[PDB]
Amino acid sequence: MSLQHEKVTIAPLVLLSALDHYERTQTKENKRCVGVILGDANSSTIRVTNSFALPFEEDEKNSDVWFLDHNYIENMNEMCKKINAKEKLIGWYHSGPKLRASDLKINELFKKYTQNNPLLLIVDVKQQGVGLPTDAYVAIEQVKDDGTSTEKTFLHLPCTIEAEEAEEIGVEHLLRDVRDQAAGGLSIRLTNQLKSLKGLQSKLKDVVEYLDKVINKELPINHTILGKLQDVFNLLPNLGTPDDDEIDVENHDRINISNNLQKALTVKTNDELMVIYISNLVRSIIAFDD
Amino acid sequence: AIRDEIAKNTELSYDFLPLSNIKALLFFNNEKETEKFALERNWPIVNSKVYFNNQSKEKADYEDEMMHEEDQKTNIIEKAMDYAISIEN
């Protein structure tokens, strides 16, 4: 067991593999599919290559009662090496829609397998979100400074992708959309700007009702969020500084280059005005002769 | 009319005039008469000295108030938005 954790990069294969696995067990309709999740671990970024289904039963009146075939997994791992001998156990995926409080007990059982603290990778099977439709958590046990005992609790790790040469080209090979959520032409990036601005608007709004809910829905004082909230205020911009004036002087600069680049285009288009007219001049004679 | 024109000019021209000096520019022979025009022309003479900087503020404020105002100032954002749609049109 390593605590070596910072990030989670996710193969596109995992997301998709887990989406089908959910519907082919047919534990769906508010019934969970839980499988093993395979990849590299013992490094800061946890690198998730593959996933398999596990036979699983979910009591839906009580999510605190489930079936897990422990034997099977040992059987499966031998097969994982055939595929790739860097695949080892690193956790188990959950099928969303989000984190639950029945997940800690399931996490327990998954400590007899992993050499790293069992990963919980929430693969949303509905595709909600404003980034990748994945959240990542890992269970870490830590004292709480409020006065209560040692809990095991899920801290989020960011979600990310990285991919192999074969996988990445396969992605484009399947796909055929030119994509307004990545860069491209001018119009394509204009779509990204408006979204990013609205993305700040959506997320800042979420903090306003979270501060209110601690004192008007009686959520607890969570020190870990609010310390980060304070460092936003320290790094926040100001006004009337010579720093903020230098910005204006740099606005002048770059727009002037654009001004001259635009004017440069216009020279070129006025020559094509003139060339077509040379094309017009010839066509006059031919018209007279016929 | 000559009085009004001068009263348009004096805002930029000075910031302080003593009351004997205001009288001189506005072609008054009576110091009382100067004080009487100031009420009507909205000049604040306080302790026998005028404050053109205040008057300037009020008139500027009125000009900011009216709808002209996005492209009167011309926003940093607004400039680039113009450029953007032209190249794609």
UniProtKB/Swiss-Prot annotation, chain A:
PROSITE patterns: MPN. The modification N-acetylserine is found at S2. Keywords: Acetylation, Phosphoprotein, Proteasome. One of its GO terms (molecular function) is metallopeptidase activity. GO terms for biological process: proteasome-mediated ubiquitin-dependent protein catabolic process; ubiquitin-dependent protein catabolic process. Disulfide bonds: none annotated. GO terms for cellular component: proteasome complex; proteasome regulatory particle, lid subcomplex; proteasome storage granule. N-acetylated by NAT1. Residues 8-143 form the MPN domain. InterPro entries: EIF3F/CSN6-like_C, JAMM/MPN+_dom, MPN, MPN_RPN7_8. It comes from the Eukaryota. Present with 19800 molecules/cell in log phase SD medium. Acts as a regulatory subunit of the 26S proteasome which is involved in the ATP-dependent degradation of ubiquitinated proteins. This is 26S proteasome regulatory subunit RPN8. The gene is RPN8.
From Swiss-Prot, chain B:
The chain holds residues 184 to 272 of 274 of the full protein. The lineage of its organism: Eukaryota, Fungi, Dikarya, Ascomycota, Saccharomycotina. It comes from the Eukaryota. Signal peptide: none annotated. Acts as a regulatory subunit of the 26S proteasome which is involved in the ATP-dependent degradation of ubiquitinated proteins. Necessary for activation of the CDC28 kinase. This is 26S proteasome regulatory subunit RPN12. The gene is RPN12. Belongs to the proteasome subunit S14 family. Present with 9890 molecules/cell in log phase SD medium.
